[PDB]
Amino acid sequence: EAEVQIDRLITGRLQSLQTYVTQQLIRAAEIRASANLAATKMSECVLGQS
Amino acid sequence: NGLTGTGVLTESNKKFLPFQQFGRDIADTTDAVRDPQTLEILDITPCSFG
Amino acid sequence: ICGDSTECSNLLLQYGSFCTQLNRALTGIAVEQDKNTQEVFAQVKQIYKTPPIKDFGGFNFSQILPDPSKPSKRSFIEDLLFNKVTFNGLTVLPPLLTDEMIAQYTSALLAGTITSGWTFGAGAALQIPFAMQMAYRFNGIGVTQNVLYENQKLIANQFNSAIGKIQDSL
Amino acid sequence: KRVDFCGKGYHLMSFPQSAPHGVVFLHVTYVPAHEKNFTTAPAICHDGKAHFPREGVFVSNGTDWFVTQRNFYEPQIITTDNTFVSGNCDVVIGIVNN
Amino acid sequence: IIAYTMSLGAENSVAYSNNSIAIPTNFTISVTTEILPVSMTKTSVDCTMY
Ligand SMILES: *[C@@H]1O[C@H](CO)[C@@H](O[C@@H]2O[C@H](CO)[C@@H](O)[C@H](O)[C@H]2NC(C)=O)[C@H](O)[C@H]1NC(C)=O
Ligand SMILES: *[C@@H]1O[C@H](CO)[C@@H](O[C@@H]2O[C@H](CO)[C@@H](O)[C@H](O)[C@H]2NC(C)=O)[C@H](O)[C@H]1NC(C)=O
Numbered sequence: 059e060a061e062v063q064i065d066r067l068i069t070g071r072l073q074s075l076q077t078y079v080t081q082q083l084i085r086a087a088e089i090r091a092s093a094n095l096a097a098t099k100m101s102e103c104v105l106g107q108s
Numbered sequence: 109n110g111l112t113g114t115g116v117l118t119e120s121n122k123k124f125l126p127f128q129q130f131g132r133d134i135a136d137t138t139d140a141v142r143d144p145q146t147l148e149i150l151d152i153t154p155c156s157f158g
Numbered sequence: 159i160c161g162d163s164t165e166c167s168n169l170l171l172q173y174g175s176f177c178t179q180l181n182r183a184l185t186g187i188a189v190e191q192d193k194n195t196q197e198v199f200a201q202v203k204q205i206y207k208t209p210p211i212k213d214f215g216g217f218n219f220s221q222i223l224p225d226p227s228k229p230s231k232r233s234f235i236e237d238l239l240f241n242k243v244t245f246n247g248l249t250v251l252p253p254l255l256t257d258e259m260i261a262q263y264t265s266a267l268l269a270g271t272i273t274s275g276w277t278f279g280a281g282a283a284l285q286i287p288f289a290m291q292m293a294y295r296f297n298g299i300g301v302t303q304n305v306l307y308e309n310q311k312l313i314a315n316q317f318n319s320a321i322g323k324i325q326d327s328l
Numbered sequence: 329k330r331v332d333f334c335g336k337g338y339h340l341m342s343f344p345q346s347a348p349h350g351v352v353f354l355h356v357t358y359v360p361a362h363e364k365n366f367t368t369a370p371a372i373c374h375d376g377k378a379h380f381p382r383e384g385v386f387v388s389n390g391t392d393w394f395v396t397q398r399n400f401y402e403p404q405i406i407t408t409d410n411t412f413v414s415g416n417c418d419v420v421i422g423i424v425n426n
Numbered sequence: 427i428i429a430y431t432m433s434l435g436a437e438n439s440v441a442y443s444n445n446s447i448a449i450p451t452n453f454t455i456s457v458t459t460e461i462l463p464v465s466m467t468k469t470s471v472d473c474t475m476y
């Protein structure tokens with residue numbers, strides 16, 4: 059039944075890891091959108107008059 | 109003293125008080141312990157990986 | 159999950175391949191971060207340098223140009239910005255580009271836009287005195303270039319005042 | 329007109345082509361080359377008046393002086409048709425006699 | 427295999443002066459590609475079968 063105990067630990071920790079990974083993916087998508095905006099602004103307003 | 113772990117043991121300059129047994133920093137991470145025979149402020153550091 | 163335990167590893171082995179996808183997602187995130195930085199900063203092909211003598215018609219750019227005395231080769235405002243803002247199986251990977259290279263790109267961009275105008279964004283940079291570049295820019299916004307050539311001193315003075323105020327506010 | 333949106337350089341036109349799950353754009357752009365050094369000046373003082381170019385810039389190969397369009401070398405003789413007058417030649421920094 | 431430090435690119439000092447300009451005399455016409463995805467495959471999945 060120790061193996062049952064480790065089963066409980068495993069499922070809990072794996073669920074926590076999955077939630078963390080999903081949050082990371084969402085935040086990275088947001089950051090990528092902001093980076094695209096920054097690159098467009100830098101190309102259009104620094105290398106030429108907008 | 110029945111507490112099992114793995115790491116590298118180094119002399120530590122932490123200032124305990126005569127009634128503690130083992131200190132820590134955060135998130136239930138044991139950092140320094142006191143050997144029953146000598147009563148020395150040791151230190152625990154995880155073995156390197158990557 | 160296991161923390162160096164054989165039994166936990168054996169029990170986790172029968173949960174299928176969940177960890178490969180987990181590692182693959184984080185690797186994609188890291189590669190995306192590197193691509194983001196590279197595509198937002200690496201905009202030019204060569205590294206430009208400002209001339210040793212700096213007489214830009216009265217405009218003063220000393221606050222933004224890099225200072226060779228500092229080892230970081232960063233400007234005043236960059237230093238202010240950098241100063242103002244502050245293991246159980248997890249690791250942190252260093253960025254592909256160090257800060258010195260980012261500073262070098264910024265300096266190259268600034269020198270190119272301060273000497274050759276907007277010409278360096280299309281082909282080869284062509285030199286142009288700074289006053290008659292601001293003349294072109296006023297012509298672009300809808301004001302005849304007579305205004306700049308008649309109020310150059312006032313324009314430069316109030317530009318310097320604005321940059322000083324922005325430095326103080328930051 | 330927005331710079332570097334589609335193609336590096338001044339944009340002329342584009343052509344689309346299909347792909348299995350996307351599109352391919354062919355951008356046609358204009359890029360200058362074979363530049364030459366010249367000596368410039370912001371305005372021209374004449375009869376005590378200041379002359380500015382309607383559209384172009386003043387250059388000279390050593391003498392003469394000419395007006396030219398910005399993106400292509402095509403000198404022309406300076407005339408009252410392509411220049412306009414505003415004020416006397418006493419305040420501009422860089423005024424030249426001609 | 428050789429490991430080195432990145433080269434950010436070429437290096438040049440543009441010739442700036444307060445009474446000198448550079449004007450082009452000839453031109454070239456260039457054609458460049460750009461590829462953009464717009465769609466992906468449509469899939470459907472049933473529970474009781476899966
Ligand atoms: C451009 O602005 C800078 C502001 O930092 C000027 O540098 C100051 O100049 C004054 C006058 O000599 C000195 O008292 C300060 O100590 C200087 N500050 C620093 C940080 O060096 C600079 O002189 C200005 N440029 C010109 C051409 O006047
Ligand atoms: C600058 O260009 C002008 C125009 O081409 C040159 O003037 C001509 O020079 C040729 C060569 O001697 C003469 O045959 C023409 O009669 C000139 N045209 C005039 C005077 O209207 C001028 O020589 C050039 N200067 C330099 C220094 O290259």
Ligand SMILES: *[C@@H]1O[C@H](CO)[C@@H](O[C@@H]2O[C@H](CO)[C@@H](O)[C@H](O)[C@H]2NC(C)=O)[C@H](O)[C@H]1NC(C)=O
Nearest residue numbers: 211213215287369370420421422423443444445
């Ligand atoms: C371009 O810069 C040069 C060098 O700074 C200026 O030449 C100076 O002109 C003044 C005014 O006649 C003289 O008193 C100086 O002796 C000149 N310096 C040298 C080194 O010869 C020139 O006037 C500037 N041209 C502009 C601002 O249109």
Ligand SMILES: *[C@@H]1O[C@H](CO)[C@@H](O[C@@H]2O[C@H](CO)[C@@H](O)[C@H](O)[C@H]2NC(C)=O)[C@H](O)[C@H]1NC(C)=O
Nearest residue numbers: 372373374375376377417418422423424425426
């Ligand atoms: C451009 O021409 C004007 C008029 O010929 C020059 O103005 C004269 O300059 C001389 C010498 O400096 C003075 O003695 C006269 O008093 C000036 N006359 C007037 C009405 O101002 C002017 O110097 C010339 N510019 C250059 C750069 O030589």
Ligand SMILES: *[C@@H]1O[C@H](CO)[C@@H](O[C@@H]2O[C@H](CO)[C@@H](O)[C@H](O)[C@H]2NC(C)=O)[C@H](O)[C@H]1NC(C)=O
Nearest residue numbers: 285363364365366438439440441442446447448
């Ligand atoms: C335009 O004039 C400059 C001034 O002599 C010519 O020389 C160049 O000057 C820059 C900056 O001092 C150097 O980086 C170049 O290496 C120089 N070119 C040489 C030595 O061949 C310049 O060649 C002339 N032409 C152009 C297109 O700039």
Ligand SMILES: *[C@@H]1O[C@H](CO)[C@@H](O[C@@H]2O[C@H](CO)[C@@H](O)[C@H](O)[C@H]2NC(C)=O)[C@H](O)[C@H]1NC(C)=O
Nearest residue numbers: 359360361362363400401450451452453454455
């Ligand atoms: C502008 O550039 C074009 C192409 O770079 C030049 O045409 C070339 O001229 C040389 C010399 O006669 C020939 O060997 C090439 O075969 C030509 N190329 C083509 C595609 O025709 C043209 O002469 C240049 N014009 C100017 C004024 O510089």
Ligand SMILES: *[C@@H]1O[C@H](CO)[C@@H](O)[C@H](O)[C@H]1NC(C)=O
Nearest residue numbers: 109142143144145146147148
């Ligand atoms: C335990 O015994 C050893 C050997 O006699 C001695 O060196 C040590 O000081 C003792 N420790 C305590 C806490 O009495």
